[PDB]
Paper text:
Further inspection of the cryo-EM structure revealed that each NS2 domain-swapped dimer binds to two FluAPol complexes, and the terminal helical hairpins interact with the PA and PB1 subunits of FluAPol. Residues K18 and R15 of the N-terminal domain of NS2 form two hydrogen bonds with residue E629 of PA and residue D2 of PB1, respectively. If we superimposed the polymerase protomer (Pol1) onto the previously determined crystal structure of apo H3N2 polymerase, the NS2 binding has little influence on the conformation of polymerase except that the flexible loop between residues 550–556 of PA subunit could now be modeled and stabilized by the interaction with NS2. Interestingly, we found that the NS2 interaction site overlaps with the binding site of CTD of Pol II.
Genome transcription and replication of influenza A virus (FluA), catalyzed by viral RNA polymerase (FluAPol), are delicately controlled across the virus life cycle. In this study, we have solved the cryo-EM structure of FluAPol in complex with the viral NS2 protein in which NS2 is dimerized to stabilize the symmetric FluAPol dimers in a highly ordered barrel-like hexamer. Our structural and functional analyses show that the viral NS2 protein facilitates the switch from transcription to replication by affecting FluAPol dissociation from host Pol II and by promoting the transition of FluAPol from its transcriptase conformation into its replicase conformation.
Author numbering:
A (entry chain A): 183 to 716
B (entry chain B): 1 to 184, 207 to 226, 242 to 632, 657 to 671, 681 to 756
C (entry chain C): 1 to 81, 88 to 248, 691 to 756
D (entry chain J): 5 to 121
E (entry chain I): 62 to 121
The structure:
């Protein structure tokens, strides 16, 4: 019994004999079984006998012989003149849809905090606000063309007044709850909630539609997404990331790994994509905590990041504010609404089509100390209504896997080449300064760069993939991977071929509806195709 | 300069930087499954692919069924589910001929698995559809509810603790004229046909509870067969797959008397699930089990019979709205068979119009096809036979082929003296596959000379077989305590290095990120740091009073000594020989009030935790009460012949008498314990 | 006292009585699995939220007599509503607290302590970059103990850790394994935990094997450093460096007194008979022996009775 | 020896230019590493460590500790008695300051001696 | 002075392995240029090994 044999042994004595097992159909299952056979049979026993008395004579050959010749798989060759550019859709230009704006943001620094100062974000935001003079009377310079703009003006004024009115309190609060006002109620959509009843009473009503089953609009490609990507690959004057330590190294392979990761970290430490990563992590964590803590209040949440300066001083930065609605989240799909306010120095009237979901105000003037003398430039504010998720919060809280992925890609490229030339090629990648890689385009032709540039480019690509997730990206990636493999096979002198080339294309275009990142990727693929076979 | 990373491929080959194409590092935050919209499309399409079959009406359920077997041969290149019994049987016979003794050893190895399995096996897996509540529940709850309902109606045969008895009782249940369901006190009645329908429905697909036990044995037998074939790459994973890809290319490139050509193909199959048919599975099972005892045949043949006549649940329904009164409502699918079609749009209208004949009690009938997943290792076996048919002795011509084939992805290599032979071989393979019920996707396949191909995200260049089929680790905190998280993290990193292809440089940065997260979560920073938390004063005092600062754990102020070479060693054993005597005595003191290769320590604490059955935790109480009498039950399974109450009472009496004799406790409570035991014995007499 | 009064009211309810009366000891592990299947509600976030609260962990009542309520800073270390305590209490204990000798630790965790000795006293060689093919063999990750099979390792563990719950076999044989005597002599007054000791002994004494794609050494020493030696396109060279005779007459009798315990068979006599609880519940009548009853050639001598 | 290094390196480079072998490249890398290690070892050879300062005056320096302790509490008791006896204010403040100074300096000396041994 | 004592360990193994590899390559070649190169190699290896051993003995 210690092994698992006592039960079968005990259930095997039928009086004075021994029976191994018993199992019968005997009933409804018999009738169900008799109806699960090929059409020329009636009983299971006859089918079993026919299967038992089977010998293969000539069946497959005869069936193949009596089959039509229209069923075939003919190969058509893939030549240098075969491929054609992918077709992109046409229509009105596309617009911005990120959670926080990237290229057009400025900061209000508290500069150095005391090294022992660890405090509440509200007072850090207030101290950052105090160091600025130059507010004016706000007014609208670009309307939302959908909604009421005076509500936006009143919301900004109320935020400023409620931030100033802290001093009328006996005790200092830890968090700020906004008053439930008409304009804030309109902005957060607290009075457009449909009411739910049973179908029986509303059977005879009229003007009832199924749902928002409408064909998506088609939009073309603009020139601002390329500008954003260009700016995202540059270097800054801060650090934005400091990693911990590990033990000392002994084995040679540890030395090689340490040198690889040290070069990579030194090259990608000061990039702007790291700032985007930190911004996303902080904002999402704060907003999730506020949603879980306060459930029936209009809470004010600041936008804050931290970094280390060139000289070695800690700094704190402020980007704007977020006002949260009501958060009663039972599952991971429920949506919480909010409104966002951000500072900027970019004039909205140069590219009005980029900002289609925004209302822009003018709030003050800024003094610039650059070069000789002092000059003043206007300051603006961007306001918008949005509501994200509970899952996408967790998605935003994990953005260091982009760093992990970039390091893995670089290491894989090194390791692939280390196997053909059977030596160690990590020194020939980084230390050598005469190596150049094609990573750009210009009216003159194809340009070149250094290893740090390709590292930062890969990191930026990973970050932008994280920030613009959609199924179109998946479909395009798969189909483009297939086409790229076929083109490489052609370039390697291996005489490739295809069975149906029109269908692959048709899939590529049908996965190209509306998103700007996907359209930029398609344009990049077309530009690659025009050079790889010419 | 305008920067785009795609032009990096003009200098680096595609296979060297193919990892730049995959965009994600995890599961994206959106869903594409959809509800009732896609199920109707699936049903309509799988019925479209086999229109020319034979229509019949069920005599035990009352549902239409379609039989496409032995239908007309196809005339175009569109997918067609018209298979022939003769071809399948001949392919199986030739597979048996090529590898003599492959079908008997599997049956003998599977019989002992069948005859010894226990009932606990059904509690492992994902969520399972529950017929007693018309929802989804974890496996344990579903099994418990099914047992409760079964015992309520006189079907008590699973008390033997054997899976086969549970299956016998399920078959007996399926042959009754009345069923009763009591909910905690409603008491609903279900007739024969309604219960039969509810015992054949599939979710939108996890199975039911009356069908998993039969699927398990079939999967076991299929795995046993697949383990003995070299053309199957499914059960293996890792370096074994790399060896499998290397061996076929080595075999086909012997280049003896080199006057012959070689070509390879990367291919996919279109509409895999909705072109299979359970009848061919039944035929395969029947052929496999020749010259075997009859009960084994019945047990292995039960499941395809149930699949051959199954019901598909639609979903939750539709949501409507009004643009004037600010109103919204939900339409269940149970009343979808009779509502007027003026409300819906064009697509939904035609969908509903086409789906109406196949609708019974909110579920549609779907005989011809496999829903989703399931029977993977049997479809692989069916696929491997066509590859086996490519030997010289069976083609009887100049060309011949071989390859390896997974559940849905395949690679094939063809050899011929000229181009015409290669074309003829490809055509014959295509036609033979279409003869059995497998369709090849033309728009997702290409052909080139041998030297480069792909198989399930395993990219093969001239000698390098880099793979990208798995994702990166989590490098986060598990959430048990401050002694179990370190071991889990380092073990995960080590296992990913060993099994997958995680590089050495990436492991170090993963360790760095894990340490950062650990320190932030548990508020344990180094003693010589300016970060202020609630735990800083104690850490600084301990740091100041300590002589050897390299022997303190990371949990309390110490630095980390981990690197690649010592990821397999526990932390305490690693730092043992560098810490002070008093620190050792305090830390490893087995009388603490507080208490994957970890030592006990004072850091292993526990945090604060926050119908059918009247109480759902009734077995657990009886279980936990047992170890208080027999502490060894937590280490190994007990063995005995008596009941639980006998052992408990006997041990209690013995312990009470020994305690009284030793004088540890006075005489007052001895009589009380004796009378309580006598009362328990009296209540047991009923 | 508490356990018997908890058992008393379980049989009061009719539904639990059927379970307690219709279930054999052999089927306890079968019903143990019917617990639940849904708990993973993002454990990392839960732990992060729980560490923010004060008093997040639990301890026994006697902590209030060993740890002061406040420290020199003036911070609360525990609160009264098992009681609730804070991590500061654990740090305080590690800083100030009673000390005990740790001489038994290197004998309970020696399988871990040999690994560090192997790693420290080892030497390294060069690294080669090339391509190689890996094949599969049978590898042993736990070497086990020589002259001991998997059948008697469990017996040894049960005798050492749980002397009162051995039954039938081990209790009727006439022998005594040597290793049992030393294990029982050394671990005379260790108070770590029965379960931890049992797991560690099982890990030390029991051999278990698996399948691995090894391209180098085969011995158990080379398997534990498999993540340091091999790679996708490189290889690193490294050398490690370095109980009397009894019989069952039947079930319990009411004419020979109450049942006894296994550890109280020491007194006994020269052939009396008494009933005892052996294993996990069985009570049987036993008696001392008068002959040898060995397994010598006498079994084969029966062949004279056949083939005349 | 160095001349042998560069000559043999050039010879292997020429040999490898005409044919590629795994071992050839391996020995090339190993020879480069060995030459660098020899150069660094020779750079350490013509400098050594500073053993001259490692054998400085240390003998009696270990024994004047007891001599100083001999006169520590003697002078502290002398100052105590003189402070008790005296009657000016100048002398009183001077002796109080001296007592403080000796307390601090003797504690410093004891701590330094305890740390070093 | 602790790090050098552990590089010394790895240098001896490198020298030994390269000695056997070059000896085998010498045994398996049939071109006078290669044997001249390998003669020069073996001489250099013997000299450098002796010097490293002497320096290692001096360090302790």
């Amino acid at each position: 019994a210690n092994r698992g044999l006592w039960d079968s042994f005990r259930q095997s004595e039928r009086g004075e004999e021994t029976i191994e097992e018993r199992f019968e159909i005997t009933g409804t299952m018999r009738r169900l079984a008799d109806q699960s056979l090929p059409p020329n049979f009636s009983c299971l026993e006859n089918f079993r006998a026919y299967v038992d008395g089977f010998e293969p004579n000539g069946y497959i050959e005869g069936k193949l012989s009596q089959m039509s010749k229209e069923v075939n798989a003919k190969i058509e060759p893939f030549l240098k003149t075969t491929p054609r550019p992918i077709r992109l859709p046409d229509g009105p230009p596309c617009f911005q849809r990120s959670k926080f704006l990237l290229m057009d943001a400025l900061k209000l620094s508290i500069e150095d905090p005391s090294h022992e100062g660890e405090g509440i974000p509200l007072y850090d935001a207030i101290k950052c606000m105090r160091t600025f003079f130059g507010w004016k009377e706000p007014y609208i310079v670009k309307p939302h063309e959908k909604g009421i703009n005076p509500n936006y003006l009143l919301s900004w004024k109320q935020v400023l007044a409620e931030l100033q009115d802290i001093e009328n309190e006996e005790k200092i609060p830890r968090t700020k709850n906004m008053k439930k006002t008409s304009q804030l109620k309109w902005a957060l959509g607290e009075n457009m909630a449909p009411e739910k009843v049973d179908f029986d009473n509303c059977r005879d009503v009229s003007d009832l539609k199924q749902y928002d089953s409408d064909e998506p609009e088609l939009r073309s490609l603009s020139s601002w997404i390329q500008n954003e990507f260009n700016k995202a690959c540059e270097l800054t004057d801060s650090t934005w990331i400091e990693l911990d330590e590990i033990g000392e190294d002994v084995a040679p392979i540890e030395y090689i790994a340490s040198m690889r990761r040290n070069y990579f970290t030194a090259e990608v430490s000061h990039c702007r994509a790291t700032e985007y990563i930190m911004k996303g992590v902080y904002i999402n964590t704060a907003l999730l905590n506020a949603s879980c803590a306060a459930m029936d209040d209009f809470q004010l949440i600041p936008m804050i990041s931290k970094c280390r300066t060139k000289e070695g001083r800690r700094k704190t930065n402020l980007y704007g504010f977020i006002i949260k609605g009501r958060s009663h989240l039972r599952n991971d799909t429920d949506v919480v609404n909010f409104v966002s306010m951000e500072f900027s120095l970019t004039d909205p009237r140069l590219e009005p089509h980029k900002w289609e979901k925004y209302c822009v105000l003018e709030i003050g003037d800024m003094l610039l100390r650059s070069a000789i003398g002092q000059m003043s430039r206007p300051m603006f504010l961007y306001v918008r209504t949005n509501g994200t998720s509970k899952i996408k919060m967790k998605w935003g809280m994990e953005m260091r896997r982009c760093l992990l992925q970039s390091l893995q890609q670089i290491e894989s490229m090194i390791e692939a080449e280390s196997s053909v030339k059977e030596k160690d090629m990590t020194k020939e990648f980084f230390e050598n300064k005469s190596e150049t890689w094609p990573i750009g385009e210009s009216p003159k032709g194809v340009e070149d760069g250094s290893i740090g540039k390709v590292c930062r480019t890969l990191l930026a690509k990973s970050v932008f993939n994280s920030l613009y997730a959609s199924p179109q990206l998946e479909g395009f990636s798969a189909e483009s991977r297939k086409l790229l493999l076929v083109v490489q096979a052609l370039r390697d002198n291996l005489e490739p071929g295809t069975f149906d080339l029109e269908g692959l294309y048709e899939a590529i275009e049908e996965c190209l509806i509306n998103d700007p990142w996907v359209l930029l990727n398609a344009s990049w693929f077309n530009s690659f195709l025009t050079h790889a076979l010419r | 300069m305008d920067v785009n990373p795609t032009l990096l491929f003009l200098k680096v080959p595609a296979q060297n930087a193919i990892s730049t194409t995959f965009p994600y590092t995890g599961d994206p935050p959106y869903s594409h499954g959809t509800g009732t919209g896609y199920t109707m499309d699936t049903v309509n399409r799988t019925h479209q692919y086999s229109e020319k079959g034979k229509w019949t009406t069920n005599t035990e359920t009352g549902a239409p069924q379609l039989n496409p077997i032995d239908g007309p041969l196809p005339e175009d290149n569109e997918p067609s589910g018209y298979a022939q019994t003769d071809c399948v049987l001949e392919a199986m016979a030739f597979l048996e001929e090529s590898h003599p003794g492959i079908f008997e050893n599997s049956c003998l190895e599977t019989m002992e698995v069948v005859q010894q399995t226990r009932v606990d096996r059904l509690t492992q897996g994902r969520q399972t559809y529950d017929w007693t509540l018309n929802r989804n529940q974890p496996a344990a709850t579903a099994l418990a509810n099914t047992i409760e309902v079964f015992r309520s109606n006189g079907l008590t045969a699973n008390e033997s603790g054997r899976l086969i008895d549970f299956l016998k009782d399920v078959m007996e249940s399926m042959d009754k004229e009345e069923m009763e369901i009591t909910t905690h006190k409603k008491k609903q009645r279900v007739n024969k046909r309604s219960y039969l329908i509810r015992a054949l429905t599939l979710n939108t697909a996890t199975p039911g509870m009356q069908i998993r036990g039969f699927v398990y044995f079939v999967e076991t037998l299929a795995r046993s067969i697949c383990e003995k074939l070299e053309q199957s790459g499914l059960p293996v994973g890792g370096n074994e797959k790399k060896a499998k890809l290397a061996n076929v290319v080595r075999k086909m490139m012997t280049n003896s008397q080199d006057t012959e050509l070689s070509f390879t193909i990367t291919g996919d199959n279109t509409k895999w699930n909705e072109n299979q048919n359970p009848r061919m599975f039944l035929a395969m099972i029947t052929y496999i089990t020749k010259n075997q005892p009859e009960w084994f045949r019945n047990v292995l043949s039960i499941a395809p019979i149930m699949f051959s006549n199954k019901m598909a649940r639609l979903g939750k329904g539709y949501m409507f709205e009004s643009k004037s009164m600010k109103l919204r409502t939900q339409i269940p699918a149970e009343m979808l068979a009779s509502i007027d079609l003026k409300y819906f749009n064009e697509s939904t209208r035609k969908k509903i119009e086409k789906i109406r004949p196949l609708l019974i009690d909110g579920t549609a009938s779907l005989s011809p096809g496999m829903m989703m997943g399931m029977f993977n290792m049997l479809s692989t076996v069916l696929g491997v036979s066509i590859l086996n048919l490519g030997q010289k002795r069976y083609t009887k011509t100049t060309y011949w082929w071989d390859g390896l084939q997974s559940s849905d992805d395949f690679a094939l290599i063809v050899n011929a003296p000229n181009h015409e032979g290669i074309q003829a071989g490809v055509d014959r393979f295509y036609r033979t596959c279409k003869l059995v019920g497998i369709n090849m996707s033309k728009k997702k396949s290409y052909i080139n000379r041998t030297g480069t191909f792909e198989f399930t995200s395993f990219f093969y260049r001239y000698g390098f077989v880099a793979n990208f089929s798995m994702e990166l680790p989590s490098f986060g905190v598990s959430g048990i305590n401050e002694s179990a998280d370190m071991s889990i993290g380092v073990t995960v990193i080590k296992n990913n290095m060993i099994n997958n292809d995680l590089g050495p440089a990436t492991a170090q940065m993963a360790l760095q990120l894990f340490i950062k997260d650990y320190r932030y979560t548990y508020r344990c920073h180094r003693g010589d740091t300016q970060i202020q938390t609630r735990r800083s004063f104690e850490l600084k005092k301990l740091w100041e009073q300590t002589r050897s600062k390299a022997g303190l754990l990371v949990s309390d102020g110490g630095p980390n000594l981990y690197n690649i070479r010592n990821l397999h060693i526990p932390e305490v054993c690693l730092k043992w020989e560098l810490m002070d005597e008093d620190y050792q005595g305090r830390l490893c003191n087995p009388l603490n009030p507080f208490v994957y290769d970890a030592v006990a320590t004072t850091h292993s604490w526990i945090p604060k935790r926050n119908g059918i059955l009247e109480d759902e935790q009734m077995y657990q109480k009886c279980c936990n009460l047992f170890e208080k009498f027999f502490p060894s039950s937590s280490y190994r399974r007990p063995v005995g012949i008596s009941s639980m109450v006998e052992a408990m009472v006997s041990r209690a009496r013995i312990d009470a008498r020994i305690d009284f004799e030793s004088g540890r406790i006075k005489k007052e409570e001895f009589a009380e314990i004796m009378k309580i035991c006598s009362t328990i014995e009296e209540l047991r007499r009923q | 006292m508490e356990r018997i009064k908890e058992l008393r009211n379980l049989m009061s309810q009719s539904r639990t009585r059927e379970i307690l009366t219709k279930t054999t000891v052999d089927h306890m592990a079968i019903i143990k699995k019917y617990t639940s299947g849904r708990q993973e509600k993002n454990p990392s976030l839960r732990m992060k939220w729980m560490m923010a609260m004060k008093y997040p962990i639990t301890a026994d009542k006697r902590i209030t007599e060993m740890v002061p309520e406040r420290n020199e800073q003036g911070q609360t270390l525990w609160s009264k509503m098992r009681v609730m305590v804070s991590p500061l209490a654990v740090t305080w204990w590690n800083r100030n607290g009673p000390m005990t000798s740790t001489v038994h630790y290197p004998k309970v965790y020696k399988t871990y302590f040999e690994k560090v000795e192997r790693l420290k006293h080892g030497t390294f060689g060069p690294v080669h970059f090339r391509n190689q093919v890996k094949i599969r063999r049978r590898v042993d990750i736990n070497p086990g103990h020589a002259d001991l099979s998997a059948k008697e390792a469990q017996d040894v563990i049960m005798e050492v850790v749980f002397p009162n719950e051995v039954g039938a076999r081990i209790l009727t044989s006439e022998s005594q394994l040597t290793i049992t005597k030393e294990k029982k002599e050394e671990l005379q007054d260790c108070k770590i935990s029965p379960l931890m000791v049992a797991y560690m002994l099982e890990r030390e004494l029991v051999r278990k094997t698996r399948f691995l794609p090894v391209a180098g050494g085969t011995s158990s020493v080379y398997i534990e450093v498999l993540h340091l030696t091999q790679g996708t396109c490189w290889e690193q060279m490294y050398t490690p460096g370095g109980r009397r005779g009894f019989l069952i007459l039947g079930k319990e009798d009411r004419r020979y007194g109450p049942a006894l315990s296994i550890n109280e068979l020491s007194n006994l006599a020269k052939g009396e008979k008494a009933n005892v609880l052996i294993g996990q519940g069985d009570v049987v009548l036993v008696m001392k022996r008068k002959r040898d009853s060995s397994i010598l050639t006498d079994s084969q001598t029966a062949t004279k009775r056949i083939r005349m | 020896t160095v001349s042998s290094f560069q000559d043999i390196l050039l010879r292997m480079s020429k040999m490898q230019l005409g044919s590629s072998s795994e071992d050839l490249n391996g020995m090339i890398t190993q020879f480069e590493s060995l030459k660098l290690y020899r150069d660094s070892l020779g750079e350490a050879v013509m400098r050594m460590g500073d053993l001259h300062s490692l054998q400085n005056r240390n003998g009696k320096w270990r024994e004047q500790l007891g001599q100083k302790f001999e006169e520590i509490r003697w002078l502290i008791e002398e100052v105590r008695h003189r402070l008790k006896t005296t009657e000016n204010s100048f002398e009183q403040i001077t002796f109080m300051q001296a007592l403080q100074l000796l307390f601090e300096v003797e504690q410093e000396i004891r701590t330094f001696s305890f740390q070093l041994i």
